[PDB]
Amino acid sequence: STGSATTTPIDSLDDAYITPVQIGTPAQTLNLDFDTGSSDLWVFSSETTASEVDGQTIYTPSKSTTAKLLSGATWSISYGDGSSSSGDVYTDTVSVGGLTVTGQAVESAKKVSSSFTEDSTIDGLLGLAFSTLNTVSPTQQKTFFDNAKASLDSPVFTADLGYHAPGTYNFGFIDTTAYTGSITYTAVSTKQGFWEWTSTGYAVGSGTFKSTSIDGIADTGTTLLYLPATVVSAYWAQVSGAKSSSSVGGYVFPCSATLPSFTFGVGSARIVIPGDYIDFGPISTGSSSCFGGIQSSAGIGINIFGDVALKAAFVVFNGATTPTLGFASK
Question: Which cysteines does the record link by disulfide bonds?
Answer without folding.
Answer: 255-290
